[PDB]
Amino acid sequence: DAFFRTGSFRNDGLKASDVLPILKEKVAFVSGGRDKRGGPILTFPARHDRIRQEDLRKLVTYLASVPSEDVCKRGFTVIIDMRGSKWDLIKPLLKTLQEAFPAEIHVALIIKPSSKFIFETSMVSVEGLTKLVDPSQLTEEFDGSLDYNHEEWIELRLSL
Numbered sequence: 733d734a735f736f737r738t739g740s741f742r743n744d745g746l747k748a749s750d751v752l753p754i755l756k757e758k759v760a761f762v763s764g765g766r767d768k769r770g771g772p773i774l775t776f777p778a779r780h781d782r783i784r785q786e787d788l789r790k791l792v793t794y795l796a797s798v799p800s801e802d803v804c805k806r807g808f809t810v811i812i813d814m815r816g817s818k819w820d821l822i823k824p825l826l827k828t829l830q831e832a833f834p835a836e837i838h839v840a841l842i843i844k845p846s847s848k849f850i851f852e853t854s855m856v857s858v859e860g861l862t863k864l865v866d867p868s869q870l871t872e873e874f875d876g877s878l879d880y881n882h883e884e885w886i887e888l889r890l891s892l
Contacts, residue, residue: 741793742834748889751794754787755886762798763880765869771806771838772799773865776825777873778813788825789832796835798889807838809864813873815845826853839864843874 737744748755758777765773774795796804810829814822826840830849837851841861847853858874870876 740832740834741790744793746790746794746797748794748886748892751787751790752886752890754783754791755794755889757783758882759783759788760791760795761880761882761885762795763871763878765865765871765876765878765880766803767809767838767865767869769806769809769838770803772803772808773869774808774810775871775873776810776812777871778816779821785828788828792829792833796833804835807836808833810837810840810851811843811861811865811874812840813843815843815858817845 759779760774760776762772762774767773774792796808812822812825822842826849829837829840830851840849840851840853841856841864842853843858843861844855846855861870861874865876867876869878871878871880
């Protein structure tokens with residue numbers, strides 16, 4: 733406590749440059765898409781290289797700060813694509829969000845290939861997503877029409 737910083741990254745003023753390697757890996761992204769309530773969408777697309785827990789905590793802390801304060805106030809819709817994956821590879825993402833995500837999670841929607849978290853979780857089909865999110869607000873992976881270029885987004889964030 734005299735040399736090393738420990739605990740939450742909430743007040744560390746993380747920038748895209750602080751999380752650049754994991755941003756490039758596209759473990760998670762904030763497309764700009766909004767759910768039907770007006771809340772922001774945080775996406776974890778289909779992943780096998782093990783990631784460092786601290787890198788994931790920094791990533792979700794940074795991504796929580798991406799939407800405007802008013803949009804964030806409605807809480808996030810988290811979309812996790814589990815198609816071609818397993819529960820043992822999804823549960824650690826939910827645990828890290830519960831421990832490190834500095835904003836409210838309204839609901840975590842898991843695309844089916846249970847509910848012991850502080851936020852609501854729902855096992856849904858890629859079509860069941862459209863009940864809570866308009867397809868114009870969903871990216872390509874979920875048969876949506878929202879244009880989102882992750883590499884371009886990173887370059888614009890680095891210019892902030």
